């Protein structure tokens, strides 16, 4: 019955669709190509978007189960519109009915081919284990590559299907591994750079008989590489650690039990800031109301924005020269008060 163990279930399911003989494969590919040509013909005839007719025929052949919005279609996909399109296509004369029949058969042929060629995906994916992704994820990405290969396969060239399908399955698996295997994402070109660098380091360790220094690696990489670039690449390729890992050999003490919180201010720091605000208010209360307002509007103690001299002068209705002079004399008073009282020295940190 295979309770749990999804891989056994997947294998037993894919083992129920029979393998294809060559003539059946050729006929299915011919049906798919003819159906695509028929869809193009219907697009020309009815003057509609080929993807629309394609999705309508696919929905009809699949059944009422799968209805949902298509990213490419501009109109929303609902049963009303698909019934409208089905009735519009069922109103055409006798001659064009054969095109609709061929398209409806080609969709089923495509489904049968995609179902038939899944164990090839499984066999290609079985060699990618251990690179950060689980087996079933690789299987599904290979299945997507297989679907694309089924779309792109041309049977006129007399080549077997697996020959063209393997390329797409392999490329899909590699792209998925390069895109999704890391917690912090690295672009695919940089991933290829990391892999090439690791390969070069492995080779140089093999010949040299010891782990090479950065300069030897950079020399082996060729032009454009120096030791600093190799060190930077190695620094880039590092994977984070989990806070829930046991540091020693315990199972109760972990890595996060020793990481401090540097963001939120400590009580000492918050108290220092509060005392600084209170002392600044007390010192400014030794000034006049207007000259305190001037500096508060200039520094950001009021409303939090640093106002220009023109803005404060307009607010007080005075000349920018007058606002500058009163600001300067207020700052002189502040300097005198701090020199006489010494209440802000220790707050310079």
């Amino acid at each position: 019955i295979s309770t749990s163990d999804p891989v056994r279930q997947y294998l037993h399911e894919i083992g129920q669709v029979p393998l294809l003989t060559l003539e059946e494969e050729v006929e299915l590919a011919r049906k798919v190509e003819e159906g695509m040509e028929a869809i193009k013909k219907l697009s020309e005839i009815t003057g509609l978007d080929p993807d629309l007719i394609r999705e309508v025929v696919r929905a009809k052949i699949l059944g009422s189960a799968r209805v949902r919005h298509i990213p490419g279609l501009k109109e929303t996909l609902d049963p009303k519109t698909v019934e409208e399109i089905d009735q519009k296509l069922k109103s055409l004369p006798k001659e064009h009915k054969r095109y609709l029949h061929i398209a409806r058969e080609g969709e089923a042929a495509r489904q049968h081919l995609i179902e038939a060629n899944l164990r090839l995906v499984v066999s290609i994916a079985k060699k990618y284990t251990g690179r950060g992704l689980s087996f079933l994820d690789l299987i599904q990405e290979g299945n997507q590559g297989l679907i694309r290969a089924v779309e792109k396969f041309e049977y006129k060239r007399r080549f077997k299907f697996s020959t063209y399908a393997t390329w797409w399955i392999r490329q899909a698996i590699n792209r998925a591994i390069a895109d999704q295997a890391r917690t912090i994402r690295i672009p695919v070109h940089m991933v290829e750079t990391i892999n090439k660098l690791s390969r070069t380091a492995r080779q140089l360790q093999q010949e040299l008989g010891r782990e090479p220094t950065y300069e030897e690696i950079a020399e082996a990489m060729g032009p454009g590489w120096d030791a600093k670039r190799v060190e930077e690449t190695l620094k880039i390729a590092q994977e984070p650690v989990s806070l829930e890992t046991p540091i020693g050999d315990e199972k109760d003490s972990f890595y996060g039990d020793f990481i401090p919180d540097e963001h939120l201010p400590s009580p000492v720091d918050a108290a220092t800031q509060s005392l600084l605000s209170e002392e600044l208010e007390k010192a400014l209360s030794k000034l006049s109301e207007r000259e305190a307002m001037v500096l508060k509007l200039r520094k950001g103690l009021i409303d939090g924005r640093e106002h220009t001299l023109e803005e404060v002068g307009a607010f007080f209705g005075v000349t920018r020269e007058r606002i500058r002079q009163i600001e300067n004399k207020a700052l002189r008073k502040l300097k005198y008060h701090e020199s006489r009282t010494r209440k802000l020295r220790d707050f310079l940190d």
């Binding site: 020793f258 939120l264 009580p267 000492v268 918050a270 108290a271 509060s274």
Partner: protein
Amino acid sequence: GKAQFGGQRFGEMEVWALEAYGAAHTLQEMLTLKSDDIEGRNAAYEAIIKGEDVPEPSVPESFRVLVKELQALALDVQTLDEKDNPVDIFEGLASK
């Protein structure tokens, strides 16, 4: 730990001893003003260095952590008053 300049652990048994002594305010200090009550501990330090008495303790941060983690498990935990009307412990930051 000594190396991290940390503090002593007031475990379950110490809380049981405090409860058996009937010392409610000392226990409430241990649970809030001396750990994971940010506003409470900041105001307590300010009041002490100003010579005043420490203020009223507030909701611990670990209770908010527990509430959010339970909301992550698709469970709705609500704090209710005597009339069963909702009372917010996040002062509106977590509510749109």
